[PDB]
Amino acid sequence: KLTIESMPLSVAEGKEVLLLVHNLPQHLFGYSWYKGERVDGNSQIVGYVIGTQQATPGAAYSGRETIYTNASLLIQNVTQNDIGFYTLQVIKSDLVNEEATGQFHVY
Amino acid sequence: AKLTIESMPLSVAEGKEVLLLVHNLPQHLFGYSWYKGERVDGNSQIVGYVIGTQQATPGAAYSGRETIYTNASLLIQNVTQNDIGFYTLQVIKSDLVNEEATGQFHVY
Ligand SMILES: [Cl-]
């Protein structure tokens, strides 16, 4: 069951947070990370194809975000206004796909 | 400032992956070099990475497990049970008065 863990859960403003991914399913084509709680193209940070290892930024990419090979997302220079919701869509090879949302708390 | 390395996570299940994050990079950098172990030593170099060109070149200690990112972070996959966990970053400044820092993780 796919879930997202924040390291750390509470993030000092301007510091960085790692979003770790637990329980990735098998037979994956790639990952997509979104700012906020929903899978929405206008809030996409990155699309990442595993086989090619090609990250392509989406309209929400700000320069702060880095995706890793294990699907983890590092966000640097976290802003005070950030509600902290980030959403991962796992794209399976059969396209019956899964999502999970995590959040951190800025102070 | 003071350059330091943080393991995400600090304790790593054997065969899983660990991210070495870098804190307090100085300014006016030419690149990064990552080493296996506690010392800057060519025989234990994983990668040399030039920032401007984004060119990573592997060193003799590159095993296939290690990937350097543009922010200096190093991701190590398939961590072995025997791994003592020490990894060392050398930051190469443009004036060559350089800095090092060592981090470690603990395999279980
Ligand atoms: Cl150059």
Swiss-Prot record, chain B:
Topological domains annotated Extracellular:
2-108
Q: Which residues are glycosylated?
A: N71, N78
All residue ranges annotated as the Ig-like V-type domain in the record: 2-108
| Cellular compartments annotated | Membrane
As for PTM, the annotation reads: Tyrosine-phosphorylated in response to microbial binding.
What domain comment accompanies this record? The cytosolic domain is involved in S100A9 interaction.
Q: Which family does it belong to?
A: Belongs to the immunoglobulin superfamily. CEA family.
Q: What does this protein do?
A: Major granulocyte receptor mediating recognition and efficient opsonin-independent phagocytosis of CEACAM-binding microorganisms, including Neissiria, Moxarella and Haemophilus species, thus playing an important role in the clearance of pathogens by the innate immune system. Responsible for RAC1 stimulation in the course of pathogen phagocytosis.
Q: What is this protein called?
A: Cell adhesion molecule CEACAM3
